[PDB]
Amino acid sequence: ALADVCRTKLPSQAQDTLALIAKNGPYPYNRDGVVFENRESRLPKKGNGYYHEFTVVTPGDRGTRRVVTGGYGEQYWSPDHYATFQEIDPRC
């Protein structure tokens, strides 16, 4: 599969995003929560609208860092506007 990464190892801002998602916002950007279509099949392949994307703030202007969520609560880290993904392990 993809690499696993511990939630506590992610940047403070990525964790902030994880917490806002758990909270359902309110979100800092108008594009927070739009569908991610996984057009490159880097995440597991699912039906339309399975994935949504959320900005991880970069002390910067909106930047490249993202969390993507799946429909059953999967969370993935991408620092590079979807070029690479890690699956976030909420256990560590």
User: What are the structural domains of the chain?
Assistant: 1-92 (3.10.450.30)
Active-site annotation holds for 40: no
Structure tokens of 78?
A: 């991408």
Which is the catalytic residue, given 37, 40, 53, 74? Answer: 53
DSSP conformational letter for 72:
T
End-to-end, the C-alpha distance of the chain in Å comes to 19
**Experimental determination approach used:** X-ray
Question: In whole angstroms, what is the distance from residue 76 CA to residue 68 CA?
Answer: 5
22's enclosing H/E stretch is helix 12-23
Active-site annotation holds for 53: yes
**Cis peptide before 28, with omega less than 30 degrees from 0?**
no
Rounded to 5 degrees, φ, ψ at 50 are: -70, -35
